[model samples]
Target: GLDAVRKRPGMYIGDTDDGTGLHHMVFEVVDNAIDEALAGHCKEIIVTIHADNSVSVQDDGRGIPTGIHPEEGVSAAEVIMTVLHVGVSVVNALSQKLELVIQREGKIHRQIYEHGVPQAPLAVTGETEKTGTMVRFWPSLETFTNVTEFEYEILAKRLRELSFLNSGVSIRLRDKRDGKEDHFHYEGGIKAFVEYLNKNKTPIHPNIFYFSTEKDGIGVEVALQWNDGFQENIYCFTNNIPQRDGGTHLAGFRAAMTRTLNAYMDKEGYSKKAKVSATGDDAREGLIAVVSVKVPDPKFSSQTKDKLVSSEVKSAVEQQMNELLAEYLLENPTDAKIVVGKIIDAARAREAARRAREMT
Candidate 1:
């Protein structure tokens, strides 16, 4: 549907004309890199926002397909610039949408797009062998009407969220308009994300649990750490896409976490005071976790793709997660005990916080 977000970008992203629009450009590219991460090809992405109104982004991942696109009938790189609502390279065998992935060689393909219109096709300019997409875009002074520039700060929120979402992919945001650039990358991935989420608080667990596996047409990855914060930082992703509204996958994960924790605590003799539905909030208070599932044919709520659509994914994730995470916990009892103790304390603290919130 061309009536998609860009058709009414304002309604979808909260604002269409100003800083948000410029920030949206970075987001559009970042999503592609995140896709690379899901495919297990990307390790780092370098994003340079030139002071001269041009932006350049490069990643160390499997370059976009060099082969011709079936429907578009053009080189993959051209489609990346000219097309809108095309799908990423991973879904190339499927229907059409805004395809964002680009083909790459040892050389760089520099394409110029003004206000999202391609001025020309990509050309191979000699560069390193790093396989990734590099974008050089000049914002149209005309379309950007009121605002004349893109700011580094405006994109901080989305950038941080993306870093949190893509466990180990390193993302660097820099200002290269002046031939100068700053860099940011996280080896800690979601573990670092959770630590940052609890920046103002203390840590309840000394370690973060991280694991991954593939099963029943889906790939699962999970990371967890508990902090002294009162809130839980749980992120749900379906095939590399963040489910901001957290559909069934999230519901299943929550259910499994509560059930498993309650069983463990009960067996350990932590009674009555420990459970109460063993609420999701209590089980994961101050907990930081990243849950990812990459399925061959993902069904999202809409073209907007901000939520998951399959109810069955929940059961799949729950079954695999419990079987695997349970073994991880049992084998690493030293670490597991610390994590459990942290949650228990968080459960107590969350109740107190609830009482405090009620007063104010």
Candidate 2:
């Protein structure tokens, strides 16, 4: 497996020659820990980048199964750390030396790997009451010769985003190299995400519209606010993976936003009074929204997984947002009026631009 990865390293992790590529290995390891958090077993995760270029990830979750693997004839810990595509297997392959320590069932298990090859069998190292997994690895100098010091800020930024994306999850990053440290924890979820995005701007609405609902093994959460500024910010994600290019989920959100606001205006006779209808862009002017969804199996348009591809996500998100936004407008008429009025203003501006273009 290591040989295959060596032959086609890019196929597993895009590019090791750059900082982004080097960080992918770190993300892979942290993602495994995040999966545990998503499973509701983890609460805290710690990441440390050492001066020696060694990275360590520790999580407070049920440790990897330590029993023997009937098929592999080795400990499950070994299988997970060395064999499975999950866990830190890819990091193991790309690292010069890797160590795994797991606290499980009151026993601490340890294993060592060198360049993806196991150097020792999984053995009981000690005893502990807590449960979790810890991995420390030094990137292979030969494999990533172009990579230099790890960017603490980049890692902290991503981890902080993840903490916001996952409610109740806490992640801490410490740079032993420079003694810089940061911690992220967000019980407010995407509401806090919107607040962060709007930190520098004033909001048109006093309260952000926020809702979270789950159906058919799919969970959707949305937070949005309209700012006094002209810029629009829409952040989309699938299973906590940021989708900067957006996807069907984003489409669904835009559709629901436009439809619900237009419906509200039409019902209140505002649309007829103003003699204008709202376009999706009109309704989204100065909008800051975060749409996050979690599904059983996520599909992405590319291997990078930056764009969600699942068509079902669109309808799921649309249905939820439509219901929630409609209810929100009904409950908060003042906010609804302001939002609809803003949309109408945007429509008038757009019409003016169109007329100007035609005249020119």
Q: lDDT of all predictions, in order shown?
A: 0.64, 0.86
TM-scores for all candidates: the values are 0.71, 0.93
Candidate 2: segments with Cα more than 4 A from true spot: 85-87
lDDT of 1: 0.64
Q: What is the lDDT of residue 321 in candidate 1?
A: 69
User: Quick one: best lDDT, which candidate?
Assistant: 2
Q: Candidate 2, residues 1-360: lDDT per residue as tens digits?
A: 547775666678777787766787888888999989989988999999998888899999999899999998999888777774534677788788998898988999999889889898899999998999898888887777687568888898889888888778999999988799998998888999999899898887787899999976789999999987667789998877788899988999998998898888889898799877668888878999999898889899987777888988888999999999999999988888788878889898898888899998
Q: Write the per-residue lDDT of candidate 1 for residues 294-348, one digit (tens) a residue.
A: 7788788876567888877888778876776677677777776776776666666
Total residue pair clashes for candidate 1 = 9
